[PDB]
């Protein structure tokens, strides 16, 4: 993440078509932008909590479609079942977790990086 360059951000929310000056509640709200494709969303349109929003703004964040597994760097045939960390929004295939997961976790899920 420290190494891969960041795409030019699009200053429009892909979900509501507002800018940083107007979200769905007619209020200003800064965008977050995918580092790989540049497409953007308001945290409120992405349904991110304030805490998750703070963490992803400090990371090389990827949108839902661009998200690659932090362990294997792939999307692959099992991409749709990639888990998204509820602390940092990184993606992990279940088979790439440490330890590997046979089944979907229940409730909020925290990845191997965020776990103390």
């Amino acid at each position: 993440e420290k190494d891969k360059p960041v795409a030019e951000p699009i200053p429009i929310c892909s979900f509501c078509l507002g800018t940083k000056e107007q979200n769905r509640e007619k209020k200003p709200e800064e965008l977050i932008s995918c580092a790989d494709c540049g497409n953007s969303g308001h945290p409120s349109c992405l349904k991110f909590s304030p805490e998750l929003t703070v963490r992803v703004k400090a990371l090389r964040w990827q949108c839902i479609e661009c998200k690659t597994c932090s362990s294997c760097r792939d999307q692959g045939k099992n991409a749709d079942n990639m888990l998204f960390c509820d602390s940092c929004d990184r993606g992990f295939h279940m088979e790439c977790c440490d330890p590997p997961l046979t089944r979907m976790p229940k409730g909020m899920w925290i990845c191997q990086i965020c776990r103390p």
């Binding site: 699009i10 892909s14 979900f15 078509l17 839902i64 998200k67 079942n81 888990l83 998204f84 993606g91």
Partner: peptide, 25 residues
């Protein structure tokens, strides 16, 4: 937990791209 698939659904649809293009320029 969220997966790519469930996050697509729970987030809600993207706006029509033609409308995002009309706005992007």
């Amino acid at each position: 937990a969220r997966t790519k698939q469930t996050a697509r659904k729970s987030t809600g649809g993207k706006a029509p791209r033609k409308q995002l293009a009309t706005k992007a320029a």
